[PDB]
Amino acid sequence: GSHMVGQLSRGAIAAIMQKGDTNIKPILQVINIRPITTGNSPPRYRLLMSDGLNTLSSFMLATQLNPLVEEEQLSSNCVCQIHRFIVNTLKDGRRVVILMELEVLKSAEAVGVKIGNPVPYNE
Numbered sequence: 235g236s237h238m239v240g241q242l243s244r245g246a247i248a249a250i251m252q253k254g255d256t257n258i259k260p261i262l263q264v265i266n267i268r269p270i271t272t273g274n275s276p277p278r279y280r281l282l283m284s285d286g287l288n289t290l291s292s293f294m295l296a297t298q299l300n301p302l303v304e305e306e307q308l309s310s311n312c313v314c315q316i317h318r319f320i321v322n323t324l325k326d327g328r329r330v331v332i333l334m335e336l337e338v339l340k341s342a343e344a345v346g347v348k349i350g351n352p353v354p355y356n357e
């Protein structure tokens with residue numbers, strides 16, 4: 235409906251990144267999904283997601299959720315709620331947000347556009 239950015243958990247990305255809040259169940263929009271190079275291991279998908287205010291490109295899908303991508307329920311523009319996630323920190327200090335459980339609330343086709351004008355979150 236009207237006021238589209240009101241559909242997303244504005245501020246959730248900062249909360250995840252600045253506070254390390256892990257109990258929230260934020261509603262985010264998928265902006266993009268891309269496979270990452272794994273080779274011989276099952277594919278892994280990296281997601282660029284939006285909370286309406288920020289985007290963040292450091293989301294990774296748990297392997298168990300691969301069929302959502304492969305069968306196309308989880309795709310660019312869809313709106314989803316993250317029911318479980320974990321943050322992992324790499325040796326170089328970058329952090330990855332692993333999506334363990336997610337629900338697609340509205341299909342890419344039913345949403346159809348990037349919501350609002352989110353700006354890239356920087357670290």
Ligand SMILES: Cc1cccc(-n2nc(C(=O)O)cc2-c2ccc(OCc3ccc(-c4ccc(C(=O)O)o4)cc3)cc2)c1
Nearest residue numbers: 270271280291292293294295296297298322328329330332
């Ligand atoms: C900083 C950042 C954020 C998101 C993705 C990347 N990335 N981009 C590329 C690439 O070359 O495209 C490759 C990677 C990348 C980065 C880190 C990686 O390893 C970390 C990592 C990945 C997954 C898991 C994990 C825990 C539980 C599960 C599961 O259930 O599947 O998966 C735990 C740690 C794996 C891939 C980097």
